[PDB]
Amino acid sequence: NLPITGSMDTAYANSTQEETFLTSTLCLYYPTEAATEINDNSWKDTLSQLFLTKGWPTGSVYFKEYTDIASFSVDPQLYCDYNVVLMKYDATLQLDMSELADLILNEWLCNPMDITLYYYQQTDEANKWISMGSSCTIKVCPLNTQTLGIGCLTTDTATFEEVATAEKLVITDVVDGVNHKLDVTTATCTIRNCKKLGPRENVAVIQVGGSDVLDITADPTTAPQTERMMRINWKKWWQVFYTVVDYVNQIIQAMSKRSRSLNSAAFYYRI
Amino acid sequence: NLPITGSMDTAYANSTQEETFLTSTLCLYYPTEAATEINDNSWKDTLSQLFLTKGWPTGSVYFKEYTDIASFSVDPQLYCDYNVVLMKYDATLQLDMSELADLILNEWLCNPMDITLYYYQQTDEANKWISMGSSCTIKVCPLNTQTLGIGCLTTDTATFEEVATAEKLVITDVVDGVNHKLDVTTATCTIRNCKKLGPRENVAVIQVGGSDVLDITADPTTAPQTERMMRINWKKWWQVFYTVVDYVNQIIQAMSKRSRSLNSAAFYYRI
Amino acid sequence: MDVLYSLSKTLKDARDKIVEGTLYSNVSDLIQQFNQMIITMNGNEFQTGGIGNLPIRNWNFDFGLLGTTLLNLDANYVETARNTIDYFVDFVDNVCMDEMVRESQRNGIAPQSDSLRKLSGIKFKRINFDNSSEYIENWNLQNRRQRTGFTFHKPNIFPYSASFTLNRSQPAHDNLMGTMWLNAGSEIQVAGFDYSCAINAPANIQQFEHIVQLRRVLTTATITLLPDAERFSFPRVINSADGATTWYFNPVILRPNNVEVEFLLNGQIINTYQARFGTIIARNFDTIRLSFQLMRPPNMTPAVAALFPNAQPFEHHATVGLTLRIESAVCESVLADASKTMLANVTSVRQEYAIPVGPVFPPGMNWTDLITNYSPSREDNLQRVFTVASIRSMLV
Amino acid sequence: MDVLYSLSKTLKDARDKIVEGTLYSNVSDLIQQFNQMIITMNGNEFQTGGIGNLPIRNWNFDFGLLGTTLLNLDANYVETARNTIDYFVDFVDNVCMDEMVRESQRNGIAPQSDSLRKLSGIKFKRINFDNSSEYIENWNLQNRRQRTGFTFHKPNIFPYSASFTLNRSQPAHDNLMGTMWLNAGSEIQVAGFDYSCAINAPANIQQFEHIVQLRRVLTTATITLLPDAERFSFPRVINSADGATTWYFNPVILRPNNVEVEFLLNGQIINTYQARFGTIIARNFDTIRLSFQLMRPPNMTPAVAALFPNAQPFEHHATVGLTLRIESAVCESVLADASKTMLANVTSVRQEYAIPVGPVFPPGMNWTDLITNYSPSREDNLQRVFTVASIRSMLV
Ligand SMILES: *[C@@H]1O[C@H](CO)[C@@H](O)[C@H](O)[C@H]1NC(C)=O
Ligand SMILES: *[C@@H]1O[C@H](CO)[C@@H](O)[C@H](O)[C@H]1NC(C)=O
Ligand SMILES: [Ca+2]
Ligand SMILES: [Ca+2]
Ligand SMILES: [Ca+2]
Ligand SMILES: [Ca+2]
Ligand SMILES: [Ca+2]
Ligand SMILES: [Ca+2]
Ligand SMILES: [Ca+2]
Ligand SMILES: [Ca+2]
Ligand SMILES: [Cl-]
Ligand SMILES: [Cl-]
Ligand SMILES: [Zn+2]
Ligand SMILES: [Zn+2]
Ligand SMILES: [Zn+2]
Predict the structure, then answer these.
(1) H-helix or E-strand containing D115?
(2) Which residues bind Zn(2+) (chains C, D)?
(3) Fewer beta carbons below 10 Å: N end or C end of chain D?
């Protein structure tokens, strides 16, 4: 990172939309019920051809399917330079979808949490505990200066304070500056101590139906809707995919390249 | 591609090896027999830890296995920023080794061929016909200026001249400027008209045992033996992998970033 | 130059003082000087023009002297004087125009037109008399190698530059820290912006700095400093540094903290003002250092607390601005300013006659280029042409 | 300068001609000039300043006239003359040193030291006599705005620059095409290299161009042009343009083909030379354009054909050179050159007394920096100091 000095009189460059479409890949994530309702084995090819009419080279648009929000939330792997997630809305899963957004609309620096040997605390507002798995039942027992417990007994997991049960993904926020004993089903869950670094620009979430319920910030005083959180009313999935294809330029405009230097192990779909 | 003007007094920058390892990744390709002889369920983990001792962050080094040279030759996909292919030497498969090395050590620009409809010719020495698949059997009938076969009959494919039989990968080099009728088992193998652009500087091939027999150029008068074509003697695979890990600095030194822009979106790892 | 100025001054005094009914005692010395000018100029041939579209003109001087026996001037005397005055004024105007359109690199201070070079001879020094104007006074001081001085109201010392620097930036341009400025004429508006409002700053303080180097040393400068930069206090879409994209700026203005304006000469602090606004004096300086701070308000009302969240998105971007305006100054070199018209005169004369671009000044006499690369040769040529322009302004 | 030069010339003539036993007829005019100098200088107080470590020196002149009335000069005459000449030579050397170490951004052609400013008065004009040296002759021509000419052997016209341009390149640096050059003093060595040896060129010909823009116009220049550039004909490891990495150069020299040397003035072709080597004449130019070609040999013996394969790897890289040496030339401005000592004298005087860096010259009188930005102010100051140095060298 170095200072960047620019003149306010500099001329605008031509549109780079065509160049980025030519030299980037687009990943579309949709629920399996979308494929069920569409009921066509060539719809991938049709959407690819329509995107080609929009400008994307053949094969640059990758279509990925997930069973549901809960299953998709188990360590989601986003591959393309631009990722669009068509997330179905359910009034009963308002938190879960929000959690999913909070995991894919932001960059996270995570480290392992071996709770059996250590008692953990959250140092600042950015620190959270992200637990992912098939079944994540997390119980919390805040401790005292002698590491014994407040309203809870370290030995008796029954007296612990229940913060999650049977979850595929949960973001846990406890009071900062307090050590907690954690009881999680490590067999079917992995919990990580994570710091949110900032927005993840290459991931957009389009909520299919419902209202604005997403809250990607644990702070109760803020519920900010970034440009990457879209919401469309729907009755047919073909219309949903057609509006995604037609306004692809608008969707990408709301997104930017990731720009983060990572250290993790995830595959990517790049050109 | 703009001219680069430089001064012969510019101070050298420090070593970029550390940051390169922190920001790149290494794909090591080995045969199945390597894992068979090693006979350990976590040799990948210990190799990764040794690489970390050598500098590469955890999850950066990828290990890919192939049955043998012939199977690996069928459309090999190279993912990491740096690729090292451990190719075992078989005295009876010299041409197959040369063909694999030619395919993965060089950059090729390929287009499809319709051998059923149109005749084909090779424009220049950089033009070849690469055919790959489960089984490639290619026969060639050179034509004269009246599109009549020479020593072969266009109608009768038995009179054709056999240049490949049951091959999984073969590079066909016919006389340039002559149109040929091609009989290829298109039901089990695809032939593509390709042009050699230049070297693939991110792929090194380590020939395990044997002598220098690789020939990545169709010219009889050249057997380059570039710096990316190493050869080692072996009795045990663990020693081979230890040599690879210890001298990974030299191996990466012999390789450079790909530097070629691809118009095709494929799957890669990039940190 | 001194001879040309003396010709112009004699002609101006003749126009002003040779009037009907005035006592000859009011003009006796002036009439003597005028007759001396006639005597010196008589029998001399001059040629002006021949450059650009300025026409070639030939000047012959064969004139009779003015009378000296009158008690009060009458109409006949005034008309007789006015014929010669008109011819001489036309000659002086043409000489000034011919000199204003020429330039040299090595010896740009010396006369360029053949007419002025001829007038620089010894025999013409008889015409020389009172040199009282500021520009001719400075010309004579420079020729004697004495200290020179020009007073400028709102000196045009800063070349136009509307730029910015981003000390913290991302491709999406949503968490930006930096400073944007306009330097124009005698005005410097600077504004340091933090999108995060220095929430993550060490002491909840963000330090902003702006160094402006003056191409000439300014002395006895009166400056007005104000704590806001209105130019950068409204929302705007700004191009990127490379021009590839554009970003959004949505200022919310907070008072600047720990304001410190330093006026430096050769890197040494000559003047310093901390948390001082209004009129200040910079006695001698060539560089200005404006260092200010954005301090996060420790206590916020619910609306203010709503403006600035703990993390992104940052929709309201904290901004602290400074405005610096040099109202008057003194410089040893010639500069364009708001009150004078020498730059306008020289540019007008060059434009009207389509003078081809010379090897010294920028095309079209553009001031931003001239002051950006204000080299000693350019200073010499500019002083020469400005003095000629003032001499011409005495008459035309 | 003319008075100082005349003092130095009179002293040098006195030292050379006032010798024991010589006829007075051999020195009569010299004795008259020397007595005129004594009379003019008598009673005048001079001070050479204390700039840097140069000592403050005070000079008083009270000397008797050199005698007449000798048929042949005797030992007493020569002793008295030697005493007076020694004092005068010390004074002149100190004045020259004091002038050599000073500079001004504006009016840098005028005298800077107080002693030379005093010598520029009218009363000392009597000392002035024969001005025959090249530097004083050109000084007088410059004073009168006449054409100036300095003849240089191996003129120091090209600032040091060892650079390269890669027209075709890639991160591996195994297939490169471009040019590398050294421009130093009066020498230009250039070499166009192709790693592919123009295997894929339109006609197996690769065109290389090198443009050297001289910062001063050279006239009547004799230039040796040689086919090969020995500086770029051996294996090298060369840093990348940004310094990130180093690439390998392994030249195999082919003769340059279709050599074309154009000497240009103001973008106009003054001289052209095709396939010409040896001595050539560039009569008036300020730019040099060398256009050469690498032509792939149509016929290659087996050893040659082994070095240039159809495709990569290219282990032997085909290079075509060109050497261009300006043996002598004429320039209207002062320049350093192999034969003269003006730059060396000025630099030595500045270094000896630890003169602080001024606002005109680069630190240490670095010639590369001086001639890279050879501005008119720099030209005036450099001509002044070089003329003073040449005056001093007549005696010291
Ligand atoms: C940009 O667009 C303009 C207008 O169509 C065109 O003339 C120009 O070539 C384009 N490219 C660049 C690099 O300006
Ligand atoms: C480069 O190496 C030098 C010497 O080892 C060291 O002082 C310096 O900090 C390093 N980094 C840079 C950016 O120069
Ligand atoms: Ca959940
Ligand atoms: Ca409890
Ligand atoms: Ca917390
Ligand atoms: Ca919230
Ligand atoms: Ca094969
Ligand atoms: Ca046959
Ligand atoms: Ca062929
Ligand atoms: Ca070969
Ligand atoms: Cl005003
Ligand atoms: Cl020599
Ligand atoms: Zn920017
Ligand atoms: Zn010599
Ligand atoms: Zn390079």
Answers:
(1) helix D114-119
(2) 153
(3) C
Ligand nearest to the CA of A217: 6
**Dist CA D313 CA D309 (whole Å):** 8
Is residue A42 within 8 angstroms of chain C, CB to CB? no
Residue in A1, A5, A7, A8 to test binding to C, most C beta-carbons within 10 Å: A8
User: Chain B partners of A111 at a C-beta cutoff of 8 Å?
Assistant: none
Q: What is the resolution of this structure in A?
A: 2.7
Specify whether the backbone of A177 is left (phi greater than 0), alpha (psi in -120 to 50) or beta. left
Percent of chain D that is helix, strand, coil (3-state, to 5): 30, 30, 35
Q: Distance between CA atoms of D372 and D357, rounded to whole angstroms?
A: 18
Strands (E) across chain C are located at 45-48, 57-60, 150-153, 158-168, 177-185, 187-194, 205-226, 236-239, 246-249, 251-253, 257-265, 268-274, 278-295, 317-331
Identify residue D113 by its one-letter amino acid code.
S
Distance A182 CA to ligand 4 centre (A): 13
* Terminal C-alpha separation, chain A: 26
In the numeric block, the tokens 């090897």 are attached to C359
From the CB of residue A140, how many other CB atoms can be counted at a distance below 10 Å?
21
Q: Is A198 annotated as a binding residue?
A: no
Q: Give, for D347, the enclosing helix (H) or strand (E).
A: helix D342-352
Please judge whether A201 and C310 are an interchain contact, meaning their C-beta atoms are less than 8 angstroms apart.
Answer: no
Amino acid present at B137:
T
Look at the alpha carbons of B218, B222, B224, B225 in this order and tell me if their dihedral is positive or negative: positive
Residues of A in contact with C312 (CB under 8 A): 198-199
DSSP-derived secondary structure letter, A170: E
SS3 at position A171: strand
Among chain A residues, the shortest Cα distance to B260 is held by A271
Amino acid at C200: N
Cβ contacts of residue D32 below 8 Å, gap of 6+?
A: none
Report the alpha-carbon distance of residue C155 to residue C336 in Å, rounded: 6
Q: Give me the residues paired with residue C248 across strands.
A: C237
B265 contact residues in A (CB cutoff 8 A) = 25, 57, 59-60, 62, 269-271
Residue B19 contacts by C-beta under 8 Å, 6 or more apart in sequence? none
Of the candidates C106, C110, C379, the beta carbon closest to that of D379 is on C106
